[PDB]
Structures are given as C-alpha cells and as structure tokens.
Design a protein around this nucleic acid. Structure first.
Lengths: 165, 92
RNA sequence: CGUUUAUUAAAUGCGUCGGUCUAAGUAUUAUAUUUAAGAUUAUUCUUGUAUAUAGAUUUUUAUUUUAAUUUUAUUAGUAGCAUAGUAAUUUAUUAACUGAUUAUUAAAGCGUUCCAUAGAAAAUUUUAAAAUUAUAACAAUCUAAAUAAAUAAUAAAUUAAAAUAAAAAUUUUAAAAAAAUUAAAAAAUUAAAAUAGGGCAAGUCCUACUCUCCUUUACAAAGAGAACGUUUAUAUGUAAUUGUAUGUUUGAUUGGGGCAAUACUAUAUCUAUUUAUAUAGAAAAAGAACUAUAUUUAUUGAAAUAAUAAAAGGUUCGAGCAGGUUAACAAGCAUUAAUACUAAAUGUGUUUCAUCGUCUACUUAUUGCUAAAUUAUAAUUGAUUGUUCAUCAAAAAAGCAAUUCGUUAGUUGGGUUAAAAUCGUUGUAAAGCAGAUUUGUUUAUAUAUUUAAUUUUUGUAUAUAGUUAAAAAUUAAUAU
RNA sequence: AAUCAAAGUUAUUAUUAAAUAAUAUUGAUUUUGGAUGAAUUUAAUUUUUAAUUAUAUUUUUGAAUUUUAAUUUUAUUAUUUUGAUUUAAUAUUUUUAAAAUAUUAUAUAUUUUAGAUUUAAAUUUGUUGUUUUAUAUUUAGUUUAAUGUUUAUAAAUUGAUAAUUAAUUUGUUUUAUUUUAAAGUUUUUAUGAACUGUGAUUUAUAGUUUAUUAUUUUUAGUUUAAUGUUUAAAUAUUUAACUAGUGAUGGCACAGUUGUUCUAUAUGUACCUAUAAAAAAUAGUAAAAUUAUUUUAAUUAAAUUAAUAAAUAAUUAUUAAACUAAUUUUAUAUUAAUAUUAUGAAAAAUUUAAAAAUUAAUUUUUU
C-alpha cells in the first residue's frame, strides 16, 4: 500500500537519580502529534526547576542539580521530572542511607522507597482519595468576587481547579 | 533531470503559496526593512480589502513602527518611498 | 518463371496510376515512387504531413501522402486473421484436433478486394521396387598381429561397487553397513560431450520517433547600386552519428509522524504549513522569494540489435503461485553445463481386492491427454533417457490479424547443422583350460491378460455357474 | 587375486646484449636519366621529432594552473684508435638421457601391524568443501620510502578593512608513489574490388518434345537426404532437385558514417565486430591473481541515507593515551588520532507473513 519511516528513539539522556547540568536534554519526549496533528500530552510533564521546550517537548533542566522522577500519587502513569538543585544535599545522605543500610540500621519505610509510596501517603493523609475525588460546586470554585475586593481571599484563581497530587 | 513537479505528498492546499498569503510587511518608515509575514486565515480569506498593517519593531530604527504589507519580491526603497519635504513644527 | 545468407505470398519485373520535369535529351518522354500482371470491380469520411498561402508561425484539406477506432457497402470469411476452439453444421474415416462444403455478426480481413490457377504444399481414391509396422532375416567391402605414433580430456586415487539416513542441492559427500582381476564390446554415472537455452548485474553497442542537444551544407532577414561565392542574425530538422529512458518492493511507492512488546521487512493502519540544503539569478543593513524521486550529483523517451563482452547466477525444483464438476491438479522466485515436451528402444523399486493381478492395437493433432472405433479395452506411483528422431517448443526469412508515433511486441503457418576415437566405474561376453553340471554364493529367466469348442449347462432361477482337458499366443539353456 | 619402495649428469665448442657518452647525418644494400629532358617536385603564421625551476592568484564552484635567469652561457640529441668506456644482464646450440626393499582372499607408504584420512586454492555474502581453477617439470610472473643531530628562524585571524595584552610546537624544507592479468568497445589514419557485390564485359564445342525462331526439356559439378562431425574439406563424398541465361563467374570502375545491394542489417580476401596500424579507455563495485613457516594481547557491527551503494555511524585496524567515591586487599579494553569499496545474526526463546521462507529478533561464530 505504501511505505513507513523508522520510529526514532525518544528516551532519557541522563540517568534518573544522578546529577544533571542544564545543557543536557533530560528526556526527549514524543510530542505525540498523533500523526502531525496539533494536540499531544507528554508522558513526563515538567517538574521542579525543569522547563519544557515547547516545540519538541524535551525537558531541559534549568539549574544544575540531582534529577528524579516523581510519579503522580493519584495515577502512576503521569510523571514529573524534579531537579533538586543541591547535589550535596542528596549525596551526603545517600552515602549515609547506603552506609546505614549496610550495617542493617536503616528503615525501609522511607518515603524514597519505590514500593512504599503507596502506603506512605496513607499514613499521613488518610483520606487523600476524597480530597481529590471531591467534586466542587461551581459556587465555591468562584468564591464571591466581593470577597476579593473586601480583601478576604488573597486572590481569586478561577481556573486552577484540578488537584494534581 | 525532468521530474520538475514532484508527486509524493502533493499537499492539499499549502499555506505559503496562495495569491497573497505570504506578504512582506515592509516598514512605513522608509528604512528599507521588511518582515515577511504569512497572512493567517483571519486575512487569508479577503477579510481585508485594506492592505494589511501592523506595528513591529523596526530593527534599524530600534523603534516600533508601522508595517504596511507589500509583495515580497521587489526593491524595498524605490524613488516612490521618498517622503515630500516638510518643515517641522520645531526650529525658528 | 527471374532472384536471394538461415530461401519464401522475401525482394525483382510488364501494364495501369500518382507526382516531377519544356535552358540538357524526346511530358504518349525520362526521372521518383506506390502497387502488382490476366479477369471483375475498385465503396463511406476525415483532425495531421504535403501543396497553395497573405512578414511566419497559428490558421487552411481539388489532386498526392497517411488515416477511417462504427469506415465496412462489394467481395470472400475459422482464413499464415490477436483469444474464443478441434468454431456449429455436413460429408469423408471402423474412429475426422484432419480437409473440403453450406452460411456468415470475422475479438478490430475488406476494395487492391475477389475470381480465375500450373510443375508446390496439403486432403482424399488408388497403385507401387526401395528391408515401411508385422520382421527377424551377413552376399559384398571395412582383422588381429608386425610397423610408424597423433587428439580432445587429465588434482588425486587401490578402492570403486551396492543399500540406508542426511543437510544446505540434483546427488556427492560424511557416516553406517555391506564385498572383486587383465582383453573387447555396449553408454548408466563421472564433464559421453561439445554448446545452445535461460533470467539478473555492471559496461558498451546499434536502431527509432511530437516532446533532450552542436559541428548541419537546407528555409527566411540583413549587408554589399544585391556580379552569383561570404558573413551575421533569427531559427533549431531524428536527414542529427550526443546522452538519458531508475530505484525499490514485482506494475505501486519515494514525505515526516504515530499507533501497534520506546522490534519493523513495508508489516498493519493512518495523518499533515511538519517545512525541499548549495550554486547563478530575485531581496543590499538585522529582513526575502524560486526548484529539483523532498539527502537534492547529469542534459529527453522507446526498442531485442540474431544485441554483445566480462561475471555469476534458473524454466524444466530436497519448498512456492493463478484461470479444470465448487474443493484434491497444469504449474511465472530461494539449488545449478542436471544443457526442452513426445515418440523409439530399453529398463526398473514400489503399491494396489477373492488364486493371482497387471502385454492392448488404432483415427485425428503431434499435442499429449483426452475424446472413440475395434465383442469386452492399457492399474497407480517413482527414477529415466546424452544411445535415436526433432514433430513441437526455437536465434531479422518472411507474412497475416493484433498493440506501437515509430523501432517494434505478442498469437498463427511455412523455413531453421542437434555432433566427438570410451579412460575410469559399470555391466554383457571372454582369457585359448577341463574324461566329471550342482555341497554353499548368486540369477535375463517364469506356464495366461485379443478364447474357442468340448464335457457338467445340472446346482441354484428367470437365467444358469465351479477342478480340468484340447487348441490357440511356438519354444526349451549347466563357469572350474 | 596380487605388491615393489627407488637413480642429481650431458662434454664441447667463443669477444653478443641493455642503459649510458651530448663531435657526423640530405632518404643503406648496384651503376638516374640512357628518347634527350618534361616523365627522378612536398613547400603555407596553430603544444611541432622544438619536450617549459614554484603551493598565490584567477576559474564553467570540483582536473585549469607560476611569469628571463643571466641577453650565443656551458641542458647539450651522442664514437673511433682501453676486445671504446662503464654498470646490469648470459648464454645457444651440438649429443647428452641408467640402476640393486614391504602380499599370499583386496580399504590408502614405513619394515612391528594396527590406528589413522577434506588434495588444494579460491567460493564460504555461514543457499556454511555450494560444482571454480590445477596433468606434470622447469623457467619467467605484480614497487605506498617503518630513520628527522651542532650554523637556523616557522606556529595565528576578519566576510573585509583591519585588528593581533590573545598566549604554543616542529622542520638546513621533508613532496615524486600508488597494485597485477583481462574485454566488447572508442577515436585517430594507412591497406584491400585476385574472394564477392554491382558497373562493365563472349555475338552460335552434345540431346529433345511441339505447328512455332517462342516452347517440353540430355543435363556429371550447385534448393534435398545420407555419410562426414578436429572429417580426405575451418565444407568434402554420394544423392534429390533444378537446369535453355541477345543479356553475363569475367576488360577497368566504385573503399570504410562507407562502396555494393533483384533488401537478407546481407556481403566488400577464408566469423563485417573490415583488415592493418596507435593507445596503457574502462573491469572493485560478487571475474583470475597479488611471492618471503616456527607468531605473542581480545571483539564484530546492523543506525542517518542512497534516480541502490567507493562515501557516515557502529565495528575492525594502525599508532598513542590518563590510574575519580562506591566495597572485596575482588574485578574490570575505557579513550584519542588516523586507516576503512559492508546493510542483514546458527540452535534456541518468540514475532509478523497463503509463506511454501523471508522477516524481525539476540548470545553463539574453533589454529
């Protein structure tokens, strides 16, 4: 019927968890133009100190620092790329966290544990399902504009309605 | 070579090529600048009988000046872009 | 009625006819062609070349050239006539893929048609010496030995046989497991062959035309008080001999994405300002346009030319594909001097119901396989044909219809070399020997498959069996 | 039946070849004309028998390139009088021509039998010894400089002017080479009309049927067939056919982008692709080859692109490198610089596809 081109490799250009300069493409994402239509949703949305390039959806860090992926607590399909700027802040803990757990003195319930995050949130915020599932009535989503002039509410944000946690 | 007109993906339409879709917004300040601009569908169709106009940074002057549209092919500072002399409201 | 390199509806040739030519040859003539004589006739209609033309192109059809796709009237028509076919009928033959006749919508014959037609090639009838089947049937000439001493080919052999499996292949090896010398005949294998037959790759060749391009001698302009030769300009002619005419999957596709295990052959689907780099031109500040198989190097498209040269690699196969009662089957791609189907001759291992089993000959066409005639009618597989033919299939020799702008292409018919001293194996014989078949090896050698008359036709039932015998198909078979 | 492994010396004879060398040169191998000449004529403003010390320029963007070197100055066309010198090469003919081991029913040379078997090279694009070459003996048989010692010094930059606090080597100037064999071709001019075309050329040496001078046809050289098949023949033997030429095997005449053609792309001297001659055309883009044993660091890869493979990654290679936490006191081929005519991966595990294998796959891949 026709031909086809080869699908390019859209994968990580750093190692997640390790330090990162800004001139490194953190991930070269598929601007999933389904077939060069103009609407896509990238796999790894941008995170802390990470800024997305508009054209090719490639995440470039903005400040040199250790990098990481934060899988969304709600849906583990939607991930952010966090770059936390301090490289010593994590290195000087890893060298402990990996020196403690060698002597068998580190606890495995750490937040950073991959398989614990499901339970970690639930120890602290026990009804977080209901805090994101709750549907807001159009009254409270647009709090009385007079409360903005009377100054009660610091600033009305009517479009920020979605709980991205 | 022959094969002067290609046939793979003859694109339906094509924005750049349409009677006046790409227009050189040359500057009304006759500094010879131009900024090629494709008229969007807001003006692709003849919504504008008037010749397009815009305000754009005139990089020569370093000032925002008018940009009157004009065909992209042609000398941009002809003996027609000379402004008639005038004595300003300054001076003695 | 002559004449030819694959030898003829090849090309000649007389006449008619078309065109040209009255300052080099006689305009009932000679140039330049198309046809073909003889006899009947020679139809309908035009889009382009040519002519004429008026600055040229563009226009433009007295005659001519080429054309007519439903020209198709005359005329013959299954015919060298694109398939459909062995055309349907009739004959003819025991049997009619023959051939001839009738008519007649012939895939798209057709007026240069058709008839007439002689020694040719067919089809009958018929007769007949070639040794035509049946059929086998040496009279003749063609020794050994003695002598002279060449050729193809040659990696080697002590194994070559033989059987079985194989794994890429036809099998040849490997392996297993088996067991016979020198001489001459045969051709099954080694390469018994040469050399044809393919198709692919890069290279070159040669021919052809509306689209590419010079050297080009023609046409037109101008310049010379134009006395004629030259030079220009504009033109570009297949008369022109240059180069292109692809690549990938098989005939479509050439882009950048995406979904299909962050595999992707093109796999399967879809999308879309996803953009066409450079160089000359175009835009002169910082801003910009055009176009190319969209990585983008070249300046048209076609042919078989008997195409070729240097290579490998298949049509006929250890595996594939599409059109036979729907479905089992002819058989366009993965090997490889195996170098066409059929016939002749000559074998073979299988396998197939109750003894037990496998010899039919013919007609048409040589295609292959059926139809069908002989009362009754050839089991199915497999390996087979360099020994033999060539009928088919077949390489510009043509021709018909058919496709092509042409060169040409594909059906159909007539044509068209088909071949070397046998070394190894192999096998048939032999080795001059013998007062004698034979212990065991191992066996070309085996009584019937073109049907009669007996006799029991009774048993059984609407007709009637069964051992046998005679005759017929007429021939005998032992290495120490 | 049968084997059995093995003879290295002729004998005898003497002034060429090749390059080189910068002095001559009207055409080497009998005696022109031999009437008296007319007959023995090769000359013209072009890389020519004339042969030229640079890397910058400039240039259809891509095969195009540097100007006196000392004005007659020596780079200049060359031998007898050292067998003319030198260095390389070396023969060629005459007639020589040789020798005494392994069974006794059968795989392959070792003495003591048994064990033992790709013949090699290529080709294997692992369709993995894939059907190619080799009779043997000897001779001949293929060109990328493995090295830097004292006079002596280099090193960048803009588009352009210019700018050069911009930081730094090396070199008494290193150049030259580039495989081997092999086409069809292709162009440049010389030869050929004794074969064969066509032009032209012969005006009556046998038979015969019919009234006929036309016409049947004796017809031993020729449309067929057998034999022959490196044959007696690079076309002959036997034979069928045909045969009536006042219009033709034949005086000489036409020649190669062309003659001739009763036209077959046929022939023009035994393949018309004419011969002959002169080239280095191309052939790495699956042709054939590419010469020296005993060695001393490993591996594969599979992506961007292709009017479909000389180019790129990745691999491999040559040369060279520096020791960044991770652990044992373990274990680690990571790189740079250059050289590089390559598109397809056994058995698995699965995945597309009528596949009837191809395709993806990814670990193998023997000195």
């Amino acid at each position: 019927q026709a031909g086809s081109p080869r699908q390019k490799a859209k994968l990580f250009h750093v190692i997640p968890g390790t330090p990162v300069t800004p001139v490194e493409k953190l991930k070269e994402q598929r601007r999933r133009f389904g077939q060069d239509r103009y609407s896509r949703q990238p796999e790894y949305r941008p995170g802390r100190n990470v800024r997305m390039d508009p054209n090719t959806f490639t995440l470039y860090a903005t400040t040199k620092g250790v990098m990481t992926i934060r899988t969304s607590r709600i849906n583990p399909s939607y991930k952010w790329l966090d770059v936390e700027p301090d490289i010593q802040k994590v290195y000087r803990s890893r060298c402990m966290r990996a020196a403690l757990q060698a002597r068998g003195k580190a606890s495995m319930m750490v937040a950073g544990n991959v398989h614990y995050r499901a339970e970690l949130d639930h120890v602290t915020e026990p009804h977080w399902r209901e805090r994101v599932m709750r549907v807001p009535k159009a009254t409270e989503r647009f709090q009385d504009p007079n409360y903005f002039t009377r100054g009660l509410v610091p600033s009305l944000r009517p479009l920020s309605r979605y709980s991205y946690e | 070579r022959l094969k002067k007109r290609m046939v793979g993906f003859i694109p339906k339409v094509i924005p750049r090529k349409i009677r006046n879709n790409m227009v050189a917004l040359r500057s009304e300040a006759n500094t010879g600048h131009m900024e090629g601009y494709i008229k969007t569908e807001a003006e692709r169709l003849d919504a504008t009988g008037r010749k397009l106009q815009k305000t754009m940074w005139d990089p020569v002057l370093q000032r925002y000046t008018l940009m009157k549209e004009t065909k992209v092919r042609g000398p941009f500072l002809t003996k027609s872009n000379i402004a008639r002399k005038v004595d300003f409201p300054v001076g003695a």
